[PDB]
Amino acid sequence: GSHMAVQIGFLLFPEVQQLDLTGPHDVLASLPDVQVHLIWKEPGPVVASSGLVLQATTSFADCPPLDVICIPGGTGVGALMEDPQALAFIRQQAARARYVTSVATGSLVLGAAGLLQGKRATTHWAYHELLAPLGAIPVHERVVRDGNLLTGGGITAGIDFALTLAAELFDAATAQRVQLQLEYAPAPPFNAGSPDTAPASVVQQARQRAADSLHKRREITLRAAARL
Amino acid sequence: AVQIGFLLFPEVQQLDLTGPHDVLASLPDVQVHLIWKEPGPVVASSGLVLQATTSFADCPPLDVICIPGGTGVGALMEDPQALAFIRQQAARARYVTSVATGSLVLGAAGLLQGKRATTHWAYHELLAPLGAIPVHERVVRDGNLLTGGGITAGIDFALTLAAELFDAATAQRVQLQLEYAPAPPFNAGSPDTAPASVVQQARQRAADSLHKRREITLRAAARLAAG
Numbered sequence: 234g235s236h237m238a239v240q241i242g243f244l245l246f247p248e249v250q251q252l253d254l255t256g257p258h259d260v261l262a263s264l265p266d267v268q269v270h271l272i273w274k275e276p277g278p279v280v281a282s283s284g285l286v287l288q289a290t291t292s293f294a295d296c297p298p299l300d301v302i303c304i305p306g307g308t309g310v311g312a313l314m315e316d317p318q319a320l321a322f323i324r325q326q327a328a329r330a331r332y333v334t335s336v337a338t339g340s341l342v343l344g345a346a347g348l349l350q351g352k353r354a355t356t357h358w359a360y361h362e363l364l365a366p367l368g369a370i371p372v373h374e375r376v377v378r379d380g381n382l383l384t385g386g387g388i389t390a391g392i393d394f395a396l397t398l399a400a401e402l403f404d405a406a407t408a409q410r411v412q413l414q415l416e417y418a419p420a421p422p423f424n425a426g427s428p429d430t431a432p433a434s435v436v437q438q439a440r441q442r443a444a445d446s447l448h449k450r451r452e453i454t455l456r457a458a459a460r461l
Numbered sequence: 462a463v464q465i466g467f468l469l470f471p472e473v474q475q476l477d478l479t480g481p482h483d484v485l486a487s488l489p490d491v492q493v494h495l496i497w498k499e500p501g502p503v504v505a506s507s508g509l510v511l512q513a514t515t516s517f518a519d520c521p522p523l524d525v526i527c528i529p530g531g532t533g534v535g536a537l538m539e540d541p542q543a544l545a546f547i548r549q550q551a552a553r554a555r556y557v558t559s560v561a562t563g564s565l566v567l568g569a570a571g572l573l574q575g576k577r578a579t580t581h582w583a584y585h586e587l588l589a590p591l592g593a594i595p596v597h598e599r600v601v602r603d604g605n606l607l608t609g610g611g612i613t614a615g616i617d618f619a620l621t622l623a624a625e626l627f628d629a630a631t632a633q634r635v636q637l638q639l640e641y642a643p644a645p646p647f648n649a650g651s652p653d654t655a656p657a658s659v660v661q662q663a664r665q666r667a668a669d670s671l672h673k674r675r676e677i678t679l680r681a682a683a684r685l686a687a688g
Contacts, residue, residue, distance in 0.1 A: 410662050
């Protein structure tokens, strides 16, 4: 549909990991035929896990029908997995969206909404055991695609799959041009973004420090699965 | 606590800032500031609204200052108040950093004279008039000055900063906890690797910005020369 706008919506919730959202937001908002939304129960300030304040732009009720929905992750996912209004919104939008996507533990929210049953998916590495009880077929890849579902565990996975989205919504030339326009050329100085590549001591520390969060998130996950 | 400040200005390219912000805010014993003339809402180039936390007047002496880029850089390069603030902080800061065309703001402030630096590829020709030695690399370091052209270069140099402020184990722990593991599906993030037509088309899209930014740059340079 040429210059018909593509409506792209990010769920913006308390204690979101903001970079999960702000990366794909800035990539996709650089496209002339995209209209991005930051969605919560009402417009207004929403505090990210770091204390950085974002502003939601639309309520659930006023959000237009989305062509792309994206659920970020972060600490705030635990509450969101048992928020019936938010889960109903997500389900409603996902029913007609061209693409359904998530970053990090945002896929656990998709799971809680019933959208991963029998689907290949990933999540943040520390929480990957929580995919199967939500019906997912867990896959360890940076971005996992199953039909129109795209999930990625890493904090910037949405930047990467945003380029895939741009290519399919528009054309490869449009995705490459956004990459060049923004000069997205990552080159980390360390190779510790996976438990399979970080030093053993670093993995040990991260695993130990995440244990209480995983324990609670499992309890939440089992209730969410029971409701499905 | 380590005092870390990002300049948050109208029409900023928000990801330039929000990437390194989320990395550095994950560290122990840091305090991260979003700095503008007064606290309150600041609208990014995409329309996304951010909230400045700290005025120029109230900002503590920073250990790290970071100037992001975006459309709003043009105005900043001819904003004496902003340029003075940046100089005052840079005089004391352990690290002075920028992303994308934020290095042109450092340049306009007189902070790149004789310094190796980079900027967004489409604006790279504007570094030498500001006294810099242009270097075509993703992150360029000259002493305690770190500049990177690409939109996420601050994520990468933030991990370097984390390692030097704390230690490499701490930086790696943050990388693992955030699961920062980029894997782009295209290889067009450099004018050396993008298709020719894509280079041409991106340049055409930037051309009026560059034209204006060139004019601004030559004015900023001439103001420095009179100093």
